[PDB]
Structure formats: C-alpha cells, structure tokens
Amino acid sequence: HMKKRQLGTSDLHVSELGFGCMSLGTDETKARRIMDEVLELGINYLDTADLYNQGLNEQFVGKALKGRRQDIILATKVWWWDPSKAYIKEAVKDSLRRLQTDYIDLYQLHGGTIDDPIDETIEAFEELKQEGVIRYYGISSIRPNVIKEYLKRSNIVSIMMQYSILDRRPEEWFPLIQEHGVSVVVRGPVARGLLSRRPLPEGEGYLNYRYDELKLLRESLPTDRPLHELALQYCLAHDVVATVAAGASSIDQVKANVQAVEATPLTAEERQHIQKLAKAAVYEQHRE
Numbered sequence: 001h002m003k004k005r006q007l008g009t010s011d012l013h014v015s016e017l018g019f020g021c022m023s024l025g026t027d028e029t030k031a032r033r034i035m036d037e038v039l040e041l042g043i044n045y046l047d048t049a050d051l052y053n054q055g056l057n058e059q060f061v062g063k064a065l066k067g068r069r070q071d072i073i074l075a076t077k078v079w080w081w082d083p084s085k086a087y088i089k090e091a092v093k094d095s096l097r098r099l100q101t102d103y104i105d106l107y108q109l110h111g112g113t114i115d116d117p118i119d120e121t122i123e124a125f126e127e128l129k130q131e132g133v134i135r136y137y138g139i140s141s142i143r144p145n146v147i148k149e150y151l152k153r154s155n156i157v158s159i160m161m162q163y164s165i166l167d168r169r170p171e172e173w174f175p176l177i178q179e180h181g182v183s184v185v186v187r188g189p190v191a192r193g194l195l196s197r198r199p200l201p202e203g204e205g206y207l208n209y210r211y212d213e214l215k216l217l218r219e220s221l222p223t224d225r226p227l228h229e230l231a232l233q234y235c236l237a238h239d240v241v242a243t244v245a246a247g248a249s250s251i252d253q254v255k256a257n258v259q260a261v262e263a264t265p266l267t268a269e270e271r272q273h274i275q276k277l278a279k280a281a282v283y284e285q286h287r288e
C-alpha cells in the first residue's frame with residue numbers, strides 16, 4: 001500500500017515515506033529488527049545522512065541490506081573541511097566499506113555554498129557516477145543561490161529541503177526545480193513536532209510564527225484529519241516532492257508515519273484552505 005514516486009529524471013522510484021535519522025542503538029540484533037520492520041512496511045528509501053543531527057548507523061544498515069540490496073535505494077551524504085574533488089571521491093569509499101556494498105544510489109552534498117569550487121564538485125560527482133560508484137547525486141540545501149547554481153550547471157536529481165505547513169519557504173522555488181526535472185526530498189515535515197499531538201511549548205515560536213499564531217493556526221487548520229496526517233499530506237500534495245523523511249524514535253512512530261502517508265491525498269479544498277491559512281514566508285538569506 002506504499003506508493004512510490006520517481007526521483008527527478010532518475011531511475012530511482014522511491015517510497016513516498018523514506019527512512020532516516022534514528023539511533024538504531026547499541027544492540028545489533030534490535031537494530032536489524034527495526035530495519036526488517038521498516039522494509040516490511042514498504043519503505044524502500046534509506047538515507048543514512050544526518051538529519052537534525054541524527055543519521056543511521058551504516059554498519060547496521062549494511063547488515064540489514066544483506067540479500068536484498070538490489071531492492072533498496074540507499075542515500076548518503078558528503079573532522080576537517082576540505083572542499084576538493086579528492087575529498088568527495090574518498091568519502092564515499094568509507095560509506096561503501098561500512099555499508100558492505102559497492103554502489104550508492106544517491107550521493108548528496110551537504111554544506112554547499114556559492115563560494116565553493118562548484119565545477120570541481122560537479123566533476124567529482126560526475127566521475128563517481130561514470131565509474132558506477134554512485135548512480136545519481138543531489139544536494140541538501142535551503143540556499144537559493146546554491147540551488148540555482150546546481151540546477152543550471154549540474155545533473156543533480158534531488159534537493160533535500162526543510163518543508164512543512166509551517167515552513168513554506170521552499171515553495172517559491174518549486175516551479176524552477178520542477179522545470180529542471182528535479183525533485184525535492186522533504187525533511188522536517190511535522191516541523192519537529194509542532195504539527196503533532198505534542199504541546200506547543202508555551203511562549204515559543206517557530207520561524208516567523210509567534211506562539212499565539214501557532215496556537216491559532218493549529219486550531220484553524222482542517223480538523224477532519226489528524227494534524228500529523230494533514231502535515232504529511234500537505235507536503236505530498238506537491239508533485240515536485242518525491243519523498244518525505246519524517247522523524248521517528250520507535251517502530252510505532254514509523255508505523256504512524258506510514259499510516260499517515262498512505263491516507264487519502266489532499267483534495268483542492270483542503271490544499272487551498274491550508275495555503276490561505278498558513279503563512280507563506282520566503283528565504284531572506286543566500287538568495288543570489
């Protein structure tokens with residue numbers, strides 16, 4: 001019942017819910033148990049990169065892939081900052097060794113800026129792709145100047161962005177991304193718990209929302225779906241979004257995310273109501 005979407009123009013067909021950001025823990029047996037359940041739910045997209053400062057243990061994920069690697073789409077990212085070709089090419093070797101596999105499906109640049117050596121970076125990814133060490137590459141960025149450079153100059157297939165009802169800054173860039181045949185991978189779709197059952201911490205805001213505005217918005221949003229489901233479905237209602245990496249701290253939370261993603265898509269009345277009710281901010285920094 002887990003649907004898939006094409007990632008950009010690539011041959012990667014990713015589950016609409018992806019898995020990432022878990023302390024799979026200290027015990028291998030239980031980590032493998034968690035992974036078996038993730039895959040049983042029809043999730044086929046595993047991103048080992050840190051999201052909100054938690055990644056996936058590559059040694060454990062490697063052991064979970066045993067016997068089924070061909071059916072899983074594996075993503076990773078690229079201490080001493082060294083922005084060279086040689087660094088990008090050497091970093092992926094480490095992940096491959098830990099993962100006990102010989103290719104990565106999607107290799108993603110984190111920490112990019114417009115002052116980086118952009119041709120060198122693109123060349124490193126293209127050389128890895130031509131050699132088959134990776135199948136495709138992408139970036140993780142909320143900087144429009146970085147995004148525009150890689151859309152114009154490279155063959156990225158994906159951009160990972162923080163995106164939710166409460167952070168609609170990405171939407172400005174969706175037409176440009178889609179015109180280039182690129183997809184968005186979403187992080188933070190539940191706004192780190194602000195679009196769930198957890199209390200809004202008193203007095204605290206979120207981006208350009210004050211506390212009182214978060215309270216009013218929770219209450220004014222449609223109530224015929226749980227808020228968590230409305231949040232995930234709002235992200236998915238945009239064709240540019242290929243997959244959402246929602247946070248989880250347990251198998252029960254993964255199962256809740258799966259149930260929400262497999263719910264009925266938003267209609268027009270629903271998506272429009274949300275667009276009108278929620279702020280539509282833009283990025284202030286790194287625009288050009």
Ligand SMILES: OC[C@H]1O[C@@](CO)(O[C@H]2O[C@H](CO)[C@@H](O)[C@H](O)[C@H]2O)[C@@H](O)[C@@H]1O
Binds near residue numbers: 208209210213279280
């Ligand atoms: O204030 C003008 C205009 O800005 C919006 C943008 O969403 O609200 C921002 O400004 C308010 C007044 O300073 C803040 O209370 C609010 O937190 C902030 O987002 C609009 O709501 C408002 O019309």
Ligand code: NA
Binds near residue numbers: 172
């Ligand atoms: Na614009």
